[PDB]
């Protein structure tokens, strides 16, 4: 392979993508997002747009959902979500293309991940760092997206101490609307999976059985093509614990623990997912990328070693 | 299956450093994007996932497939006339089969000829080794003898050997053909080249065996008679029968008569030579201890059993252990052990194999191997085909398409989702699941982008998944600022309450001086005539009619009644105003919105002020909201025109403001 | 023609310089036999006999009145010559294409039928029925004359012209009709929606001696359909 030069000169945190694949939010330290592009004749990617966003490293983006302008945010240690919003007569490889809406200070206390809510829930983000407290802004009008009209508060530790900047801030979120939210959200050593009330709340349905160590990545495996949820577990003991969470203080979920896989020998750092979610894939401190895969029974075996 | 993340700077293939290796699996899947989040790489290596590599040759392999399945129905099922209709079902699903692999040979006479990794060329190859053994077999028998169709038992026997050893290539008529130490043979190898070619059921390399060396130059020139009956040996190779096991028999009884024609004629030849022609007949008579010994391998052995000695299968229980007592069966690569275990029978437990052999080939022969009902379920009676509740076919094949999905394209969707719309089981619920779960990550701004999806619903069509598609795009292009077609897709969300606000205010506190341009949209102001021309209306209205269609009587008396914004004259903006009001928005968008749309030129001079004028057809032509409003129902939006005519210039009445003063001037006023 | 072309080899076969079996190849091979019977010239220096065989056939039964079995015999005969091979017809001349005009003429109305998807409320809602004006006059001014023997030169036949006479009569007329029901179902009056001449400009329009459609044209069977539209549009300005 070819590695793509970036421009950056400081650790990519994350990568993270559109619904395209075709545009990258990939933030660095170095203070700039430079969101790339895939040109389809090379496989190296160039450049979409070079801005400086926050003043305070960018240690995770997630692209937002585009609804009301092609958008992409970012927390950063500032306190702040910033939304930057791109117009489509914006011009590409010139430092504006995604352009300041709005600057959230209601949110307290330095933030380390925003991810967004999905579209049907309109333009809705959830916001954690160590504020300690899981806070869904919501921005309500279509026009207005500055609006920020807080839905609920629930306490992850009330106040992380800080040495939990060095803990991964897990968040994900089912795409299907077809249920009521979902998220497996980490509170330092567990992952309470803060499960829809009927109330105006959450509640804390589950929290990951076997981990007594930081948490170091959840992606929620789609809920497609499954009635239940899939999870796997980053984390700190050495372990991937692959909880296919069968849906039975409210709750409506039971854990099973199918595959219990730990050939990474080591810290697991990335879950990640296919779309769909008939991919884990699963990235460790052995230097090999294990895709796993799903053979008859639901129980996956390692597809490639892709040293 | 062995992939470097790079060739150049490398983060980690080694469990000595512990850093924290992440990779991203996104909507591509040719490129995944592998770093290291400490500060070492910054680098990001573009990494391919071995089966799902974007490419065009992949295209016409995967669509060749799903067309080969749309001749197999939607069955995917072992049905029970019933005596002859459970093997009349099976007798098209072996010819399915075939349609299969030779799809497959088609897409080998592609990766042969130029492969980037000659392992990727390789799975094509042992894939298609197990699938030669299950066609020899099960699929063009019916499941049963191969003295149901011989030649075509034959035919698999041969795509057995080509497609398993890259042969014919010469080599094996040169052998000791063409070059030990002579050059009219003598020798072990001039008839063991002969047996073993002959025992792999293979033709066009077992005659050059015979015609490219010697059977002339000691033979006929010894003697007559030690000639007439080296004549019969090959001349029982030509009269064996092809396609029946019928006459087979006579021709057992043939070969006990003229092999023993040689047995009672001369001699002045060779006992090594005379030896060996006996060893070819053994082979031909079919007997035990010469179907072992010059095979060189396994699949010669117990093919050569198969062909030469009873042509029924009975030569696999006993037999295929007398092929252990020729040669051992290969367990370095995983591609004769799976074909033991069809010979056993169990092609459920080697499926799960062939998921790493290319899962694209392996996910339709779990298709038509569930249609003759060989491979089992483990459980049975979420709908959902990524649960084993559903089919070992619907397990592989459905969720071979969702994959197609995050490959990289999204133009394999009439492929993919004409996929998930196919199986005997309730696949329905999951053509919900692909297209209603997107969200996080798509709606973009943009003009157009979601007006495909109608055609990805109809691979089936359901109409509620049909509008849920415009829900995640029809509220969404409120800052892409194209024109009408987005208020088209606003009204086809689903919605009669998106275009009583999106498309509203196009009619209502419209105004920012004196002409009551104010529309992001640029047909209003320049192309306001544009839709009158049926033009531009015409795209969005074949992509679900009524609910646009019937908007525009709306947004098309829209270029006769709107002219007045783009200059105010008393006939002419009047004519193309005082005309048409109570169809157009009294059933659809909303009611008495006509407040800076007739409303806004009371205050201008044209009409009673400090004096008496009148202006042209609104005398009594404008009688809603605009005359009487204190009684009269009026949208409220008249505050835009009571301190917003500062910019428009009036005087004599914009002082000392009443909106009975607009109740005056349209009573009297001559 | 299949079979039949190997009862030709046949009967070559059996001797003969000319059989009866010879005589039938530029006949047959009733409407399918006909028009299969004649595709024989598509290579060079000859082509000067090509529409002689064609309206020698074509009219043979037209007793069915059939001209949309002559919409790939008229077009059966390629001019190719170009590098491949490296009055006699002034009447029949125009017959050629006056043939297909009639299915065409047909389909210049139906086509603007399907063609839209809006309200057809006059006040330039649709414009796309401005050059089609022009277009459909050319059906009624078309400077040829539709389907009938034009001289005495050349060869003609009786059998064959009341075949002529009658379908000629049964769709000329139609293409002039649906040009006059533009004027009231498609509201396009001129050029423009406005002024209603046009109807009333097209009464002697109708009237030509160039196409000669008039002597064809029923003095009060197609004069009273034709009209009764001019008085609707008329009514565009009552």
Same mark, same amino acid.
């Given at each position: 392979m070819q590695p793509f030069d970036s421009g950056h000169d400081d650790l990519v945190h994350d990568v993270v993508y559109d619904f395209y694949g075709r545009h990258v939010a990939t933030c660095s330290s170095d203070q700039h997002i430079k969101v790339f592009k895939l040109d389809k004749d090379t496989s190296n990617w160039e450049l979409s747009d070079s801005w400086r966003a926050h003043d305070s490293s960018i240690v995770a983006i997630d692209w937002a959902s585009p609804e009301y302008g092609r958008i992409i945010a970012s927390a950063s240690y500032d306190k702040t979500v910033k939304l930057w919003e791109e117009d489509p007569d914006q011009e590409e490889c010139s430092g504006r293309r995604w352009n300041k809406l709005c600057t959230l200070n209601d949110s307290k206390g330095s933030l380390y991940s925003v991810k967004f809510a999905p579209a049907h829930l309109g333009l809705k983000l959830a916001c954690l760092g160590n504020d300690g407290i899981l806070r869904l802004y919501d921005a309500l009008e279509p026009s207005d997206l500055r609006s920020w009209t807080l839905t609920s508060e629930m306490k992850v530790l009330s106040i992380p101490p800080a040495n939990h900047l060095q803990s991964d801030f897990c968040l994900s979120w089912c795409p299907s609307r077809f249920s009521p939210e979902k998220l497996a959200v980490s509170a330092l050593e567990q992952a309470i999976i803060y499960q829809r009330g009927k109330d105006g709340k959450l509640h804390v349905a589950a929290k990951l059985p076997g981990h007594k160590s930081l948490i170091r990545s959840i992606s929620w495996a789609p809920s497609i093509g499954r009635w239940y949820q899939l999870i796997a577990t980053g984390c700190k003991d050495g372990r991937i614990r692959i909880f296919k969470i069968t849906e039975k203080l409210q709750s409506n979920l039971q854990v099973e623990l199918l595959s219990e896989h730990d050939d990474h020998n080591g810290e697991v750092w990335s879950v990640s997912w296919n779309l769909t979610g008939t991919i884990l894939s699963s990235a460790g401190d052995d230097g090999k990328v294990r895709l796993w895969k799903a053979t008859y029974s639901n129980e996956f075996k390692c597809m490639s070693v892709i040293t | 299956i062995l992939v470097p993340m790079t060739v150049n700077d490398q983060p980690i293939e080694k469990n000595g450093d512990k850093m924290p290796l992440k990779f991203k699996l996104g909507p591509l899947s040719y490129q995944n994007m592998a770093f290291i989040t400490a500060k070492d790489k910054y680098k990001l290596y573009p990494v391919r996932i071995p089966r799902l590599d974007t490419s065009k040759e992949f295209s016409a392999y995967v669509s060749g497939l799903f067309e080969i399945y749309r001749d197999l129905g939607d069955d995917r099922v072992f049905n029970v006339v019933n005596s002859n209709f459970a093997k009349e079902h099976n007798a098209t699903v072996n010819l399915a089969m075939e349609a299969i692999l030779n799809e497959l040979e088609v897409f080998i006479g592609r990766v042969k000829d130029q492969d980037g990794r000659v392992n990727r060329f390789y799975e094509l190859e042992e894939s298609l080794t197990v699938l030669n053994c299950l066609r020899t077999m099960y699929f063009i028998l019916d499941g049963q003898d191969v003295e149901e169709n011989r030649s075509e038992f034959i035919e698999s026997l041969l795509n057995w050997i080509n497609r398993s050893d890259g042969e014919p290539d010469e080599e094996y008529i040169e052998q000791v053909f063409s070059v030990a130490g002579k050059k009219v043979f003598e020798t072990q190898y001039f008839w063991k080249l002969l047996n073993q070619l002959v025992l792999r059921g293979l033709l066009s390399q077992a005659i050059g065996c015979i015609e490219r060396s010697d059977l002339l130059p000691y033979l006929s020139d010894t003697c007559a008679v030690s000639f007439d009956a080296v004549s019969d040996s090959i001349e029982l190779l030509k009269q064996?029968?092809?396609? !029946? !096991?019928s006459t087979f028999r006579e021709w057992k009884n043939l070969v006990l008569k003229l092999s023993q024609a040689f047995g009672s004629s001369a001699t002045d030849i060779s006992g090594e030579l005379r030896d060996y022609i006996e060893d070819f007949l053994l082979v031909i008579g079919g007997n035990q201890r010469k179907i072992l010994q010059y095979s060189r391998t396994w699949y010669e052995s117990f093919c050569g059993f198969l062909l030469y000695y009873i042509p029924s299968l009975e030569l696999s229980a006993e037999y295929l252990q007398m092929s252990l007592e020729a040669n051992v069966v290969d367990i370095t690569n995983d591609w004769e052990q799976p074909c033991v275990d069809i010979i056993s029978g169990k092609i459920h437990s080697i499926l799960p194999v062939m998921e790493s052999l290319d899962s694209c080939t392996a996910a339709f022969t779990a298709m038509i191997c569930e249609a003759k009902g060989l491979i089992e379920n483990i459980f049975e009676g979420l709908e959902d085909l990524f649960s084993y509740r559903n089919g070992m076919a619907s397990y592989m094949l459905n969720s071979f398409a969702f994959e197609l999905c995050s490959l990289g394209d999204k133009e394999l969707w009439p492929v993919a989702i004409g996929l998930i719309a196919l199986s005997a089981t309730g696949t329905r619920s999951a053509k919900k699941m692909v297209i209603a779960e997107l969200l996080p990550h798509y709606p973009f701004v943009t003009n157009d982008d979601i007006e495909w999806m109608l055609s990805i619903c109809v691979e089936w069509r359901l109409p509620e998944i049909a509008k849920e598609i415009y829900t995640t795009l029809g509220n969404q292009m409120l800052s892409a600022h194209n024109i009408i077609e987005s208020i088209a897709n606003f009204s086809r969300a689903g919605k009669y309450e998106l275009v009583k606000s999106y498309s509203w205010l196009l009619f209502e506190a419209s105004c920012m001086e004196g002409q009551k341009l104010d529309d992001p949209v640029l047909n209003a102001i320049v192309s306001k005539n544009s839709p009158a021309e049926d033009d531009v209306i015409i795209p969005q209205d074949i992509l679900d009619c009524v609910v646009t269609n019937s908007m525009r009587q709306t947004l098309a008396p829209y270029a006769v009644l709107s002219q007045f914004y783009e200059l105010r004259d008393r006939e002419d903006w009047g004519q193309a105003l005082r005309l048409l009001l109570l169809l157009i928005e009294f059933p659809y968008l909303p009611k008495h919105y006509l407040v800076l749309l007739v409303a806004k030129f009371l205050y201008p001079i044209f009409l009673l002020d400090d004096k008496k004028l009148m202006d042209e057809d609104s005398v009594a032509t404008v009688i809603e909201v605009i005359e009487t409003k204190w009684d009269d129902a009026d949208e409220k939006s008249s505050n835009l025109y009571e301190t917003i005519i500062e910019a428009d210039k009036s005087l004599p009445s914009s002082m000392a403001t009443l909106l009975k003063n607009l109740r005056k001037k349209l009573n009297f006023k001559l | 023609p299949q079979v039949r072309k190997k009862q030709i080899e046949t009967i070559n076969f059996l001797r003969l310089p000319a059989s009866n079996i010879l005589r039938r190849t530029t006949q047959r091979v009733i409407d399918m036999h006909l028009i299969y019977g004649v595709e024989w010239l598509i290579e060079g220096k000859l082509y000067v006999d090509a529409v002689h065989s064609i309206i020698a056939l074509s009219r043979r039964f037209l007793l069915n009145g059939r001209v949309k079995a002559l919409e790939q015999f008229m077009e059966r005969n390629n001019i190719g010559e170009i590098c491949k091979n490296y009055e006699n017809e002034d009447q029949f001349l125009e017959e050629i294409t006056q043939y297909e005009h009639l299915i065409k003429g047909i389909r210049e109305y139906e086509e603007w039928q399907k063609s839209v998807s809006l309200l057809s409320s006059e006040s330039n809602i649709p414009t796309l029925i401005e050059k089609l004006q022009g277009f459909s006059k050319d059906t009624f001014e078309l400077i040829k004359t539709f389907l009938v023997d034009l001289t005495s030169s050349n060869f003609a036949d009786s059998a064959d012209y009341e075949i002529l006479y009658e379908i000629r009569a049964l769709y000329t007329p139609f293409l002039l009709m649906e040009l006059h029901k533009k004027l009231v179902e498609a509201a396009k009056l001129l050029k423009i929606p406005k002024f209603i001449s046009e109807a009333l400009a097209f009464t002697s329009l109708v009237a030509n001696e160039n196409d000669k459609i008039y002597l064809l044209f029923q003095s009060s069977g197609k004069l009273k359909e034709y009209l009764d539209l001019v008085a609707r549009t008329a009514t565009l300005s009552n």
């Open positions: - | 064996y029968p092809k396609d !029946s !096991s | -």
